[model samples]
Target: SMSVKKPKRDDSKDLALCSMILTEMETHEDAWPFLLPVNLKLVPGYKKVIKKPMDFSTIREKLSSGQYPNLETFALDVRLVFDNCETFNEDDSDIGRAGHNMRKYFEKKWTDTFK
Candidate 1:
């Protein structure tokens, strides 16, 4: 079963990369803040600032369910998490660092793996 088809129809495994990328960020040491969806109630103005909020949990769901058609689409949601984090907590002592770390991690992996 080692024999396999060649290039051209490689789009199918695109989602595989996204799944692993999502997995990396979720398990990262500073991933706690971005792991789950924000609570509008507890975070009074979160909705006001970050209009399009994103998180690892949802990305995982979307990736697992094959919601994204391509790697580009999947990356947007992943980037969205960091963008929103910067908007609301750019200078935050904890969340800001976490967001920065996560972004750097994703960016490097993005290039290292595929991007």
Candidate 2:
């Protein structure tokens, strides 16, 4: 037998799942105030902005391009942003809880969202 291993299959189920999530977030009414912070700034002069708002389009592009090697890593990357908000926020308010919930939602529903 040859020492070379078989190439991995390219199953796009996770890519489709990512697309679904982005689409849902894009169309959802709560996406504005919920996904975004209250004092969101689209542009700040001169210096680079420390924080940038999430752009589902960018996520969609990457997913479509198969930028991620696997679904779990892709899901975790998106979830981590929300996780940071929940864990590192100034206070434990409804907003922080919302971030936690959003992260959890992706973790639980990513696979189901594909089909």
Candidate 3:
């Protein structure tokens, strides 16, 4: 039994889950606001308020490049995308409600895959 070490099966699993789930997010209807980086010019004070700006495209880029070492960091980035949304807007508004919807879907898939 030479070189019988497990071939980073867990890592690849995490990457697959991220890639598949991220694609889903990109196609999601409510992902409009989170598709790209926040437009600082259009939304004044966003740069100041959102110190760690994230988006689905950015996450996609990182995902394809194998930037994520584990699922925890990947989850953090995804959560931040929606968390920032919730903080910037209220649940009564459109973007705010969409943010909740996206997160709900993300969490469900994440749980079923990893947990």
Number of clashing residue pairs in every model? Answer: 0, 0, 0
Model 2's C-alpha root-mean-square deviation from the true structure amounts to: 5.1
* Candidate 1 vs 2: which has more TM-score: 1
lDDT of 1 by residue, 13-105 (tens): 677777887888888999999999999889989888788988999888888886888888888898999999888885657999899989999
- C-alpha RMSD values across all candidates: 5.8, 5.1, 3.9
Candidate 2 contains a number of clashing pairs equal to 0
Which lDDT tens digits does candidate 3 get at residues 35-74? Answer: 9998889998798999899999899998889898788899
Poorest 10 consecutive residues by lDDT, candidate 1? 1-10
Candidate 2 structure quality by residue, lDDT tens digits, 45-75 = 3124324434345556667786878776666
Q: Which has the better lDDT: candidate 1, or candidate 2? A: 1
Quick one: best lDDT, which candidate? Answer: 3
Error of 2 at 9 (Å): 7.9
Q: Which residue runs of candidate 1 sit more than 4 Å off their true CA positions?
A: 1-9
